[PDB]
Each structure stands twice: as C-alpha cells, then as structure tokens.
C-alpha cells in the first residue's frame, strides 16, 4: 500500500508471522537492528508505521501503478502550469 | 612588442596548420596589449606597424587595456595609419561622417586630439547571427538558472521562514529607524513647506523594501504548488 | 495584402530588415487607413534595444500619419527629448517630415530645446526639421526671427561646433534658399 | 618527382615470430619499411608516411608526416597482441586518406599481412568494390601463410585492380631464407 | 574524486566556431575538440580550448580518426604561450552517446589523464543546460556485468571569472541582471512549470516506452531507486502542516501590514502635494 492510510497495526505482523504480541517488539528491533527499514513510530496505541524501504526484486503492480500515478503527477503539474501560465502570462508577461 | 620578436617560421607553421584544418584564412592585422601609459603607439610600434603594412594595405591595428578600465563598459577601439604624404592634402578624406559621431564616444583630451596627429582611429561594429543569439542568449540565462530549474526555489521558499525573518525584523528595523524622523517631518512640514533641503527621498527605499518582502507573497504560491502537487 | 509579408518579416533576426519592414509598411498605408500598425511601430521603437529600428521607427508613423499636422507634435513631443539621442533625431525627422509645408507652430514652439543640447544628432536634425517648416513663411505672420538668428549663427559659429554640425547646418541653410524662394514642396 | 602519400600497415600479431622463417621478420620488414621511405625520401623528400597495425583497436602510431627521425623511434614498441583485422584496417586509412596536408599528393596504401583473412568473400567484393571505386592505389604484400597462398585472394585483386594501365601490382613471396627486401623491391612500387 | 566542475563559455562558443567553420559541405557530424582546463584543483575549470579533425564512417561505428602530432602541436605551443592550463580530456558535439566513443576515449585515457566527456547538441532547442560532465571511471556492477567503462554524470557550472561576464553583457545588451523583485521572480515562477514539463514529459515517455519494449539491460536496478524516492512521498496528508500553514500565512499578515501601512506612508507626500500644489498654482496663476 502505497498510500492511503500507510498507517498499519501488529495484528497483520503477528497474523502473518504466527508469533505472539510479546515477540512484536524484539522483531521490528530486529528489523531496525538490520538497516533495511528506518521506520519510527510515535504511536501510543499498538501501531505499525513504516518509512523508506527497497523492493530490490520486481514488481509489475508498482509498474503500472507507477505509470498511473506517475501520470497523474506530470497531468497535474501540466495543469497547474496550463492554469497558472494562463492568465498569469496574459497579465504579467 | 617588436618585428624581431615575431618568428617567421613559428607565424608561417601556425598559419600553415590553420591552413591545413578549415581555417582557409590570410592574417589581417596584429594587436597588443598597452597597460598603464595609454592605448596611444610608441615609436616601435609605429615602426613594425609600417613594416607589417607593406603586406597588406588595410593593416587593421586593435590595442585591449582592461587593466584601468572598468567592469562596465568594453568600449575598445581600432587604430590606423596615415600616409606621410597626405601632410599637403586632407587629412582624412573619408566619407559617410554620421558614424563620426559613434566615433567620438572615446573623447579622451590627451590622446586623441593630443596625438591626433599622423595617428587617427576608425569606428567598429558587431554582427550575431541568430545561432549566437540563441545558443548564447540561453546560454546566459541557463548561466543564471539552475541545473533542473527546479531545485533552488524551495530553498528560498522555505528559507523565508528561517534566515529571511532576519532580513524582516532588520527589514523593520531601517523601518522604524525612518520613521522616527517620518514623525519629525510634519513639524518642517508644517513650517515652510518651501524649497527642499534634504537630499533624502524616503519613498523608493521603503518601496524597495517592500518588493523584498513581496518574495513571501510571490513564494507563497510556489509552496502552494508544491504542497499541492 | 503586405499584411502577412509585413508581419511575418517583422520577427526577423536582422536589425536592418526589421527597418525594412518599417520602410516597407509606410508607403503601403499612407493616408491615416490603419491605426494598428503603429502599435508595433511604437512597440518596436520603445521596446527594441538596438537603435536603428528605434530611429527607423517613426518615419513610416509621419508617413501614415501626414494628413493632420496638429496631431503629431501632441505624440512626438515626448519623443523630442527621448531617453537616447537616435530616437530624437528619428523624431526630429518625423516632426521634419509631418510639418513640412504647413504652418503649424506645435512644433516650431519646441524646436528651442532641439537646438540647443551636447549630442550633434539632434543639432543637425533640429536645423533640417527647422529649415523644412520655415520654407513659403512670412515674418508678419509668425515670429521666425528665433530660428532664422540662432540658424544664422551656426555657419559663423561653425568654428567652436562639430564638423558634421556645420554640414548639417548649412545643408539646413539651403533648404530655405531652394530655388530663390519660388519652389515648394508639398506632401 | 612524385607527389603522393604512403600508408603502411604491419601486422603485430605473434605469427611473426615462428622459427621456421627469419628470425623475427618484423625487424627485417622494418627495415623494409626503412628502405622505401628512405628511397622515397631520395626521390621525393615531400612525401608523408603514416604507421598504423591491423590490430582489433587500430591506434594511429605516427601521423603522415616526411620526418621520419620519429618514425624510426615509433617503429619499435609495437606491443605484440590481437591477431587481425582487415576492415577497420582498410576503413581506418582508405577514409582516412583526407586528412593529408598536400591535396596533390596521390592516394597509395600498402599492407604487410601476416595472418589468415578472417573475411569471406562477401567483405573481400565489398571491400574490393570500395577501392575500385574510390580508386586508391592498393599492394597488398602477404608475409607468411598457412593454408594456399592466393585462392580467393586472386580474385580479390583481379576485382580489386582497376585501370589495368600501369595499375597496381602483387606481391605473393614464397618461402624462403632469403631476405624480404629484395624479393618486394623487384616491382616497380619500390623505386 | 571531482564533485563538480566549472566550464566557461568561450569553449562553447568555440563550438560556434564548429558550427560556423563547416563551410557548408554537408557532414555535420560529432566533430570532437580537445577540451583543456586545469585538473590541479579539486574543481575542473575549463578555460579555452581547440579541436582536431575528427571523420568517422557512415556504416561502420567504429572508425575514428585522431591526430598526436596536431594535439602534441597544438598543445606544446599552448602551453608555451600559457603553461598554467594543461590537456584534461574532451567533447563531441552530437547528442546521442556512441559505442564508439569507449575507444575515443580510450586513447585519451592511456596518453592522458582520466578524461571527462561532455555531450551538448548541435541545435540550442535543448532548454535544459547544455553540459553535462561525464567521468571516465569503471565502476563495479553488482548484477555481475564485466567492468567496463561507465559515465556518471557530474553536476556543471557555467560561470565567468573577469571579463567574459563583461564582454558577454555588452554583446547582448538584452539579458537582464538579478534585480530581485518582481518581473525576474513572476517570469521564473511562471515558466518554471514548462521548464520541469518539458524535461519530465520529455523523458517519461521514451521511458514508459523502455520499459515494456526495453532489452539490452538498461540497469534496470536503479529503476527501483527511481521508484522509491518517487513513492517517498506518499500524499501526505497536511495534516501536521497546517501549524506551518498559519506560519508562513503570518509572515504572509506580516507583509500584509507593511504593504498597507509603508504605501499608506508614501501617500503622504502625494495626497498633500496634490492639494498644496494645486491650489497654489491654480489661485497664483491668475
Ligand atoms: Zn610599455
């Protein structure tokens, strides 16, 4: 999940790793004791909040979404620069 | 500056390897460098400039000196050489005298006119074709951009909240620091109200003042933009 | 149909056919038929850098705009004392070129800070744009007696002027002397 | 006398040092190559020679140039890799004939070939319709050999040699203790 | 080794040079200079520059043609005349990245030193900064690949120490300086967005079409960095941002003060002397 709401909780780690809530926190110590993955989480509440991390293998979904998003980004930016350049050429020049 | 310092073989082997490559082109003239004591030509240089003119006829002479002259301007000037035997006849019997007037831009009253004499000057122009023009032209701007264009802007954008409120509390400070004479100014004001006597206008540096904090303004925008997309 | 020809060849790289759309453009709408190509010919003399447009500019605005003599000065009188001195001689063309042969003083009135000023261009064309209004003039019905003195002390004031000023000066002097007074000009 | 431009092309591989022949051929043709630019030298001092090997990256050893005072000193250190290539080794002076000083001078390349071709025939009829039709002088001189001296070859020459009036010449050596100078001096391309 | 470098425009307009000395032939090709500069210093600064006469083939790529006698010439009486600058390596005019130029530069790599490349174009249509500095290192691949030579790209400066700034600024007489405030801010940030939209739809697409018709490994390891800092910045929701909203929009107040209250000062001396003026003229005319 790129986006909307990135925010997860342990209930996925655990249902996926079949350990105990206890073990939670040894293994995302683990994960930052690697190096692979910066995430801090400044939850109250059991929360999972991750940052930057690598695939470093393929992924076609990300492919495609990559050119969805990545088109919607340079549609925007176009329009912005279509909306903004518009009048404000017409006015300022 | 001397015709013996000129080699015939290294000028000749040059020019042969120009000739060789795609500069089919013959020497026109020679130029130098006078620091200090003036652009005008000593004895030698009058002297090996008539004897690099039996060549050719026009022998078209350049002195450069911007070690005095200033930043601003790079007015330089191209010099000439008179016939002796002119002396009888005019001096200069040169048609066309409107761009005598481009040529009176270097209106020194020593040089000039000081050894007009046997020694006068000829104007200069400039040509760009649109390859110049262009490729220099962006050239010069991109010398003033930025690499993507896009990477210094947030630098400033986000710096007016960190350096530039400096800049505005100081900003505010020769604000103020006018102001307090601004409340002693309706008294004068309110006295004589002729003649003006101080030389100070108090109304384009507080316009100034304003265009640089109209930067918030304008990068308001661009922070919109870039939150936004 | 030089509508097109003319606004295409205006967007050209060489300063001097963009005076040759100028030169072109100014017999073509003679007779005051298009007010739109001054918006260019005025665009192009202010906003250009180079002076040769700048100075080329406002022969083809006198050249459309000949038919009235009492509405030029009112547009060219900012232009008598303009920023550089090509864009007074240039104009002092125009107010040469736009006046000649009538009698109107809108711009004798301003030919007095023409002639007098450092530059030599706008000396010479003060004393051709004067000698080109006092032609077929009478004194009693004008006061000329400004412009024939101060144009009379330039050919013995020559010695501490320049030596194109002086050309101009007596060249301007001719003007007046053309054909023993009996010939004319008339646009 | 003669104005024209010499083009030489050694081959650098390691078939010229077997025992079976000189010993070590590559200072004997040297000195062949010492022998016609001094005699071109006595006959016409104007002439450049240039230096370039049939290696897989051909480099351009000494520009054409009539000093050879250098080119001695070039001759040597002809680091001995690769073993042949033949259409970079014709294309890398045939089109580089244009960068001579002297437009006057005419256009003659010769070659010492040392290894088998590696080309079929395919390239030696491209390659031959190339210079029959750019019209370049070309001697080709074939040091050494494995297989029959002159199979395709003839006919790569007999296709390649246009203006059959005082045209070009072949050289086809036999074995031999002999000395190679003489047996390539005996047409009328040296002297 | 070099984190940057500094290339004047004389080298460029040398290039003019290129394009005006052709004489109308017909070739046009990568015709390669000597590029020059001093490699003493940390920073690369090109100072001039000459050419050689370069030829290639027209089928086949890898035929090149250089001159030692030309660059040892050319070079030993340059450095006779100006020993302070010295032979760094040097650039090709085309805009496409030949296989060819591993061997052009690879001479220049045994009889020099490591030699950066620069590739421009031939036609200034290019609104992106025309030099890009290319080192000539070989770096090690983690897929496995043979070393090879690679050019990574070094950032570029176009600057002019004394007088190139000078002669430049008199030559044009149409660019403008700095002058902070309105136009030369609203024209950047008008044009700003065409100058990342031609760059970024520029590339994506030839990208877009690389990826689904693309062989040849393009190093498609770096494609996941692409993509990762690309998705480092997921829409966030603004919702911590909002405090630096009312930050920048009381900086915002701030100039809103000084706008109305210095231009309510500067009426002053207009809104009196409008007054004053007037109806002294007016009752003193008469
Ligand atoms: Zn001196």
Request: glycine share 6%; hydrophobic share 40%; aromatic share 6%.
């Amino acid at each position: 999940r790129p986006a909307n709401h990135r925010q997860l909780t342990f209930e996925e780690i655990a249902k996926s790793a079949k350990i105990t809530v206890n073990e939670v926190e040894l293994l995302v110590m683990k994960a930052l004791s690697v190096g692979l993955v910066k995430g801090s989480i400044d939850e109250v509440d059991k929360r999972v909040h991750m940052t930057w991390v690598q695939p470093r293998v393929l992924d076609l979904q990300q492919i495609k979404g990559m050119k969805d998003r990545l088109e919607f980004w340079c549609t925007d930016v176009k329009s912005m620069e279509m909306l903004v350049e518009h009048q404000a050429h017409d006015i300022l020049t | 500056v001397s015709v013996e310092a000129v080699d015939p073989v290294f000028q000749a082997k040059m020019l042969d390897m120009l000739k060789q490559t795609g500069r089919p082109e013959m020497v026109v003239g020679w130029y130098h460098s006078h620091p200090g004591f003036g652009c005008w030509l000593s004895g030698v240089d009058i002297n090996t400039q008539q004897s690099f003119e039996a060549l050719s006829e026009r022998a078209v002479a350049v002195v450069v000196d911007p070690i005095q002259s200033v930043k601003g301007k790079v007015v330089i000037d191209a010099f000439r050489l008179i016939n002796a035997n002119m002396m009888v006849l005019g001096h200069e019997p040169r048609q066309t005298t409107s761009n005598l007037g481009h040529l009176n831009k270097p209106s020194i009253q020593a040089l000039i006119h000081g050894l007009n004499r046997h020694y006068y000057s000829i104007t200069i122009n400039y040509r760009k074709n649109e390859l110049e023009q262009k490729m220099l032209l962006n050239l010069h701007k991109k010398s003033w951009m930025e690499g993507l264009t896009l990477q210094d802007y947030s630098e400033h954008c986000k710096h007016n909240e960190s350096v530039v409120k400096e800049m505005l509390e100081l900003a505010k400070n020769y604000n103020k620091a006018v102001e307090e004479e601004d409340k002693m100014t309706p008294e004068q004001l309110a006295i004589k109200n002729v003649g003006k006597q101080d030389p100070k206008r108090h109304l384009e540096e507080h316009v100034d003042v304003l265009m640089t904090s109209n930067i918030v303004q304008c990068l308001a925008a661009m922070l919109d933009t870039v939150v936004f997309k | 149909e030089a509508d097109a020809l003319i606004e295409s060849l205006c967007r050209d790289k060489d300063p001097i056919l963009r005076r040759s759309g100028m030169y072109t453009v100014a017999m073509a709408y003679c007779g005051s038929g298009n007010n739109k190509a001054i918006r260019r010919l005025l665009h192009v003399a202010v906003s250009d850098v180079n002076d040769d447009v700048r100075r080329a500019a406002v022969e083809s605005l006198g050249f459309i705009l000949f038919r009235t003599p009492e509405q030029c000065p009112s547009v060219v009188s900012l232009l008598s004392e303009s920023y550089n001195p090509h864009v007074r001689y240039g104009a002092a063309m125009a107010l040469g070129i736009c006046c000649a042969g009538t009698g109107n003083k809108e711009a004798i009135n301003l030919l007095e800070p023409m002639t007098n000023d450092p530059v030599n261009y706008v000396r010479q064309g003060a004393l051709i744009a004067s000698a080109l209004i006092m032609i077929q003039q009478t004194e009693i019905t004008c006061p000329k007696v400004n412009q024939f003195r101060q144009l009379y002390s330039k050919v013995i004031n020559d010695k501490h002027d320049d030596v194109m000023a002086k050309f101009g000066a007596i060249l301007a002097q001719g003007i007046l002397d053309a054909g023993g007074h009996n010939v004319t000009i008339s646009l | 006398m003669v104005l024209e431009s010499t083009m030489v092309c050694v081959d650098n591989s390691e078939y010229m040092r077997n025992g079976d022949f000189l010993p070590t051929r590559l200072q004997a043709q040297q000195d062949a190559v010492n022998i016609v630019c001094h005699s071109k030298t006595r006959s016409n001092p104007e002439n450049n020679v240039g230096l370039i090997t049939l290696a897989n990256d051909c480099e351009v050893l000494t520009t054409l140039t009539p000093d050879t005072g250098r080119i001695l000193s070039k001759l040597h250190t002809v680091q001995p890799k690769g073993k042949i290539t033949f259409c970079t080794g014709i294309r890398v002076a045939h089109l580089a004939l244009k960068h001579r000083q002297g437009k006057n001078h005419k256009m003659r390349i010769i070659a010492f070939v040392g290894s088998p071709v590696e080309d079929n025939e395919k390239d030696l009829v491209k390659l031959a319709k190339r210079l029959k039709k750019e019209k370049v002088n070309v001697d080709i001189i074939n040091f050494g050999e494995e297989e029959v001296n002159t199979e395709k070859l003839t006919a790569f020459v007999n296709t390649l040699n246009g203006k059959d009036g005082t045209g070009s010449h072949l050289v086809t050596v036999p074995p031999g203790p002999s000395l190679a100078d003489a047996l390539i001096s005996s047409p009328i391309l040296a002297g | 080794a070099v984190q940057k470098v500094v290339v004047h425009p004389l080298v460029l307009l040398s290039v003019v040079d290129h394009f005006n000395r052709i004489g109308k032939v017909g070739n046009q090709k990568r015709v390669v200079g000597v590029l020059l500069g001093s490699w003493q210093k940390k920073v690369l600064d090109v100072s001039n520059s000459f050419a050689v006469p370069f030829d290639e083939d027209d089928k086949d790529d890898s035929v090149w043609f250089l001159d030692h006698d030309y660059l040892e010439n050319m070079y030993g009486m340059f450095k006779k005349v100006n020993a302070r600058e010295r032979i760094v390596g040097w650039y090709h005019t085309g805009p496409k990245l030949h296989k060819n130029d591993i061997a052009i530069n690879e001479l220049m790599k045994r009889y020099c030193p490591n030699s950066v490349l620069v590739i421009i174009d031939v036609k200034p249509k290019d609104l992106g900064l025309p030099t890009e500095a290319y080192i000539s290192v070989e770096e090690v691949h983690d897929d496995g690949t043979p070393t090879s030579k690679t050019f990574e790209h070094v950032t570029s400066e176009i600057g002019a120490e004394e007088a190139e700034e000078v002669g430049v600024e008199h030559l044009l007489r149409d660019i403008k300086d700095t002058t902070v405030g309105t136009l030369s801010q609203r024209i950047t940030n008008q044009v700003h967005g065409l100058k990342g939209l031609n760059s970024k739809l520029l590339d994506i697409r030839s990208y877009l079409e690389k990826v689904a018709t693309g062989k040849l490994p393009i190093n498609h390891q770096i494609i996941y960095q692409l993509q990762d800092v690309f998705n480092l910045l997921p829409d966030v929701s603004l919702q911590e941002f909002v405090k630096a909203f009312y930050l920048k929009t009381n900086d915002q107040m701030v100039v809103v003060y000084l706008a109305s209250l210095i231009r309510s000062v500067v009426a002053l001396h207009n809104l009196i002397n409008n007054k004053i003026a007037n109806r002294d003229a007016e009752k003193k005319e008469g």
